[model samples]
Target: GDDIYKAAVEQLTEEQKNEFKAAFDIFVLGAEDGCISTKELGKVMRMLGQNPTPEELQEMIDEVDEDGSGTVDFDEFLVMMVRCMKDDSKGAGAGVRISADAMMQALLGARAKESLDLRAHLKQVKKED
Candidate 1:
C-alpha cells in the first residue's frame, strides 16, 4: 500500500500533494469524527448510492485493518485512503493529518515556512449554541 502511495505521488508536485490530501478529506471525513467507523462508512456509502452488502463492509474493514484491531485508527485509515486515492479500484480514504511541512508549503508555496495565523487556513466546523 505504501508502495502505491509513493509511486502515485512520485512524479507529483506540492499542489498535487495538497490535492491528494484534500480529496481524502473530502471523501473520507464523513463522520466528522477523528476516525471512520463502519457505521459511518455505511452512511457515506448510502449517501453515495452504494448499497454494499454486509460482506463488502467486512472486506473493507479487513483490508484496512492490517493489525486486525477491532477498530481502525488514523495510520490504518491513511493507508486505506492512500491505496484508494492512488490509481485503483474503490477510488477512495485519510486521517486528515496536516504536517508542519505540508501546512507551510500550503501557506507559502515554498517561499516561507509557516502559516501566518494557522487558524483560518485550518478547517473549522460549527458548534451548536
Candidate 2:
C-alpha cells in the first residue's frame, strides 16, 4: 500500500491531516485507542448509505492495512482517503465508491469545530518546529 500511497500521504496539508484525523477519531467511535475496527467500518459505510459485504469489508481494510494489523490505523486511513480522493478527482480508475467526499463531510460535519481547533493546534506546533 505504501508503494502506491506514500506520495499521496506526503502531499497532504496540515488542514487535510486534521480533517482526516477528525474522521479517524470518530471512526474509532470511543475505542479511543486510535484504530478503526472492521465493525466500525461497516457502520460508517452504512451511515453513508452503503452496505458492504463482509468480504468487501475485509478487502477494503486489507487495501489500507499496510502493516497487516487487521485494523485501519490513522496512517492507513489517511493513505486510503487520499487514494480515494485522487482517484475520484482524476476521473479514471476502478475505485470503489468510498466517496471520500461524503465520508469526510459526514464525519467532519458531525463535529467540525473540534477539527478546526485541532488544525489550529497543528499549525501552532508546526510553527514551533
Candidate 3:
C-alpha cells in the first residue's frame, strides 16, 4: 500500500495535493490522528442519502484500507483517489469508484478529477449547498 501510495502521490500537482488534503480533512471531521473510521464514512454517505449496506461500506474500506487496520488513513485514501482520478475509465470496482469520486468531487470541485460515478453527482450537491 505504501509503495502504491508513493507511486501515486507523484502524479498530483502541488495545488492538487493541497486541494486533496483539504478535501480529506473535511471528512476527517476534526481528527488529529488523520484517520477516518467506518462510522464517519457511513455518516457522510447517509448525509447524501446514499444507503449503502454495512457490508457494502466495509467492502469499500477494504478497497483502500491497505494496512488491514479496519480504518482509512490518508495514504490509503490518497492512493485510491489518485488511481481513480487518473484512470479516466478503464477499471476499478463500481463501489470503490462510487465513493472515491463522490468524496473527491464533493471536495475537489468536479472534473474527471477522481473515482466514483458520484463525482459529478455530488459536486452539484456541494455547489447547491
Candidate 4:
C-alpha cells in the first residue's frame, strides 16, 4: 500500500501535518459535517500524542484552513490521515486502516434509519382513534 503520509509530507509543512493528523481522526469518528467539534478535536489531539489546550486546539483549527475557505477539504483530510498512520520513530507506517466504502455505507445506513423514524413518527401523528 502506498503510504498516504508520504504524499502529505510532500504537500504540507511539519506543523501543518500534525494539525492535519488530528483533524483526520476526528473526521473518522463520525463527524460527517466535515467540521470537527471542539470535544472531538480534543480527542484527535490526544490520539496524536499531544494534550492540546483549548486555545491550542482553536489555533490548530484556524491554521488548517489553508485557503481561508473556513472548511477542510479532502486534500487536508488526506494529510491528517496520512500523518496519523505514520510511525515516526521507525519511519514505518502506522497500522490504522479504514475503508472509505465502509464509512459511506455507515452514513447511508444512518440516513435510512433517520428517514424511517421520521415516517413512523408521522404515521403515529396521523393515526385516528
Q: Which candidate gets the maximum TM-score versus the true structure?
A: 2
- Top model by lDDT, which number? 2
lDDT of 4 by residue, 12-122 (tens): 444433444453544555667655544555554444334546654544445445555344545654544344333312212333333222222222322232322322322
Candidate 2: where is the Cα deviation over 4 Å?
1-10, 67-69, 89-96, 110-129
The runs of at least 3 residues in candidate 3 whose Cα sits more than 4 Å from the true structure, single-residue gaps closed, are 1-5, 46-49, 66-69, 86-99, 108-129
Which sections of candidate 1 miss by over 4 Å?
Answer: 6-16, 19-33, 66-70, 75-82, 85-129
- Candidate number that wins on TM-score, 2 or 3: 2
lDDT (0-100) at residue 89 of candidate 4?
A: 27
Q: What are the root-mean-square deviations of the candidates from the true structure over C-alphas?
A: 11.9, 9.4, 6.0, 15.5
User: Candidate 1, overall lDDT?
Assistant: 0.44
What is the lDDT of every predicted structure here? 0.44, 0.62, 0.61, 0.42
lDDT of 3 at 97: 40
Residue 17 in candidate 2 has what lDDT?
57
Rank by lDDT (best first): 2, 3, 1, 4
Work out candidate 3's RMSD over C-alphas: 6.0
Clashes of each: 1, 0, 4, 2
For model 2, where is the 10-residue window of minimal lDDT?
Answer: 120-129
TM-score, per-candidate, Cα-based: 0.42, 0.64, 0.61, 0.35
Backbone collision tally, model 3: 4
Better of 1 and 3 by lDDT: 3
Over 9-96, each residue of candidate 1 has an lDDT whose tens digit, in order, gives 5433445444445533443455465555566555556443356655556556666654564345555544443454332344234312
